[PDB]
Amino acid sequence: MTMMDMNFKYCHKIMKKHSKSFSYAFDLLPEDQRKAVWAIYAVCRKIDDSIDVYGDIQFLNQIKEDIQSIEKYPYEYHHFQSDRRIMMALQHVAQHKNIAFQSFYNLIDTVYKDQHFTMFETDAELFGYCYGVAGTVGEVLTPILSDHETHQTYDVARRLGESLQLINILRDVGEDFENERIYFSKQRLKQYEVDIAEVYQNGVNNHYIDLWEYYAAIAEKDFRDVMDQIKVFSIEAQPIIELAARIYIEILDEVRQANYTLHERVFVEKRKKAKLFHEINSKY
Ligand SMILES: O=C(O)CC1(CC(=O)N2CCN(C(c3ccccc3)c3ccccc3)CC2)CCCC1
Ligand SMILES: [Mg+2]
């Protein structure tokens, strides 16, 4: 059990803690691929959580500088300014894999922006945000999940990232509203005559359900497009990625069964995840 094992085990802990579903699927990858996934995940999570450490951009700028050190000198010893365990594991991954560093920088830029968040005028802006926060992370994962990356591999991974984000949005409407965030676009809220504050106070209605289902149908079509292009990924990652997906599709059903409540977080029971993987894996 080396120092490097401990760094990876820490990254695992972070991923298990903050996303049971992704944890459940990507943990099924062969050992060197899953460890690379944990490290990427943990870095992205730290970026996502950085503003609330002191309440400003300090820690986020140290994370960015750590990443830039790795990118510029992948083989030098660095005294990392942010979370050393995570940055050592990332550096280890970078020595073995072609990481898209600009995709971490895009992610970090989306975080800086989110300090002065203003609602999206249009869906194009919402989708731009899903790229920023999640398509970027798909791009970063691409060399880990495929043998030979082409632009298609990046395109599928990116679309998978964004459609997972859209599903998070649709699950978390109420919690996000409490945190003063609404991610549905002003254009689409206006068109469907929906006011989130009003829906949070008074319950769902038919306009809200129609708005929600509008975006659910986008996520679902994107998901089918990903599944039809599953073979861009390595054979070992294909059932894993198919499973990660299927579980997020199921989140949409969990929301509908809970009548679109804006007052709790719904989830796919662990035993249900094991059932989806049985279903998938029978066909692998
Ligand atoms: O709970 C929450 O608030 C949100 C959760 C985390 C989450 O949904 N995302 C969406 C993007 N995935 C990417 C990813 C990064 C690293 C490893 C696996 C997956 C990804 C991007 C692209 C392709 C696949 C996967 C990471 C962050 C935690 C609870 C479950 C949903
Ligand atoms: Mg959200």
Swiss-Prot record:
Catalysed reactions, semicolon-separated: 2 (2E,6E)-farnesyl diphosphate = 15-cis-4,4'-diapophytoene + 2 diphosphate
Source organism (scientific name): Staphylococcus aureus
EC number(s) recorded for this UniProt protein: 2.5.1.96
Gene3D superfamilies: Farnesyl Diphosphate Synthase
Matches recorded under Pfam families: SQS_PSY
Protein name per its UniProtKB record: 4,4'-diapophytoene synthase
Function: Involved in the biosynthesis of the yellow-orange carotenoid staphyloxanthin, which plays a role in the virulence via its protective function against oxidative stress. Catalyzes the head-to-head condensation of two molecules of farnesyl diphosphate (FPP) into the colorless C(30) carotenoid 4,4'-diapophytoene (dehydrosqualene).
Binding locations of (2E,6E)-farnesyl diphosphate 2: R45, Q165
Entry's Gene Ontology BP terms: carotenoid biosynthetic process
PANTHER family: BIFUNCTIONAL LYCOPENE CYCLASE/PHYTOENE SYNTHASE (PTHR31480)
Gene Ontology molecular function: geranylgeranyl diphosphate synthase activity; metal ion binding; squalene synthase [NAD(P)H] activity
